[PDB]
Design brief:
The structure holds two protein chains of two kinds.
Chain A lengths: L3 H10 L13 H17 L3 E4 L3 E4 L6 H11 L7 E3 L10 H14 L4 E3 L7 H4 L4 H8 L2 H11 L5 E4 L3 E4 L11 H4 L12 H7 L1 E2 L6 E3 L6 E3 L1 H10 L4 E4 L3 E2 L3 E4 L4 E4 L13 E6 L4 E7 L3
Parallel strand pairs in A: 1-5, 2-3, 3-4, 6-10, 7-9, 10-13
Antiparallel strand pairs in A: 2-14, 5-6, 8-9, 12-13, 14-15
Helix pairs in contact in A: 1-4, 2-4, 2-7
Chain B lengths: L3 E2 L13 E2 L3
The chains are: A alpha/beta, B mainly beta.
The complex binds zinc ion (2 copies).
One zinc ion binds next to loops of chain A.
Chain lengths: ~290, ~25
């Protein structure tokens, strides 16, 4: 039947504890989270149409205790609406607790809480970068495959009040109309090339004019004038993206026409970066809240 | 509506902030 409130309560019990303390749900509880959230994802559009006010977060990458701190600053649900831009698993020590809390909040408040797909919500990536190993050690392989079946149904992009375009990676040279996003059928894997790939993998680059090759070996880079023509063609004010670690937790691009959000401080036990969360009120007036390392 | 920014938000596009991709 899925005791959501008991799951959420145990996930929050370690709030304020020796950072790194595990929450070991049962296998059936986690599978219930995956099966229920998967239903909700498929029942909602692959291109979300959201409305302010809300708070937007970037990569978490298994830093569960930093995620709990974000909620302390911005208000635990349902006090605030939330949109996460992807990359919940891999790299960090506690991907499981991270993704379970987010899925539980998705099930609990399916209209005030939203999760986008990042490039790490993909079996071929998170098999390698930590999530699979965490599943093997703490549960079993079959649970990882259940997570994959859920990740394959995550929405890809969101538009907030018809003026803010949100995705994990960035723009595609194959993105002519938002209909190409709505057309993608779920469940799906992330292809090695094309629109869905670029939406999860591409980066902005100040030294590129049109489209350049991406250092990652996947997808493309895009320049400041690609942003302008996109925003103008689709009557938008801002592109909100993640996917890239940034010193301040946020970083503007192309005269504040694009912003990069990263929410995991001291990423990979390195960098000494900070994390940021972007608050949007109902007027579409936007601000940043900074999460410094701890 | 229109996206505007609060008076305390700093524009850091040209301030030489560090960025990175993989670890
Ligand atoms: Zn990413
Ligand atoms: Zn990432």
């Amino acid at each position: 039947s899925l005791n959501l409130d008991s799951i959420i309560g145990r996930l929050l019990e370690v709030q304020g504890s020796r950072p790194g303390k595990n929450v070991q749900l049962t296998e059936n509880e986690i599978r219930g989270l995956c099966l229920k959230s998967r239903e909700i994802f498929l029942s909602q559009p692959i291109l979300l149409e959201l409305e302010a006010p809300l708070k937007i977060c970037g990569d978490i990458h298994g830093q569960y205790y930093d995620l709990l701190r974000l909620f302390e600053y911005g208000g635990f649900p349902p006090e605030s609406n939330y949109l996460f831009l992807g990359d919940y698993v891999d790299r960090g020590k506690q991907s499981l607790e991270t993704i379970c809390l987010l899925l539980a909040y998705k099930i609990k408040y399916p209209e005030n809480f939203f999760l986008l797909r990042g490039n790490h919500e993909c079996a071929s990536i998170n098999r390698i970068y930590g999530f699979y190993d965490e599943c093997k050690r703490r549960y079993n392989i079959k649970l990882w495959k259940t997570f994959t079946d859920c990740f394959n149904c995550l929405p890809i992009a969101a538009i907030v009040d018809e003026k803010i375009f949100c995705c994990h990676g960035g723009l595609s040279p194959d993105l002519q109309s938002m209909e190409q996003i709505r057309r993608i059928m779920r469940p799906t894997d992330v292809p090695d090339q094309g629109l869905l790939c670029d939406l999860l993998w591409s980066d902005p680059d100040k030294d590129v004019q049109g489209w350049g090759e991406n250092d990652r070996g996947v997808s493309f880079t895009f320049g400041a004038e690609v942003v302008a023509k996109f925003l103008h063609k689709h009557d938008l004010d801002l592109i909100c993206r993640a996917h890239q670690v940034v010193e301040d937790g946020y970083e503007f691009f192309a005269k504040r026409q694009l912003v990069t959000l990263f929410s995991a401080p001291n990423y990979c036990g390195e960098f000494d970066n900070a994390g940021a969360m972007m608050s949007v009120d109902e007027t579409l007036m936007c601000s940043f809240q900074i999460l410094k390392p701890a | 509506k229109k996206v505007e920014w609060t008076s305390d938000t700093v524009d850091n596009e040209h301030m030489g902030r560090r960025s990175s991709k993989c670890c």
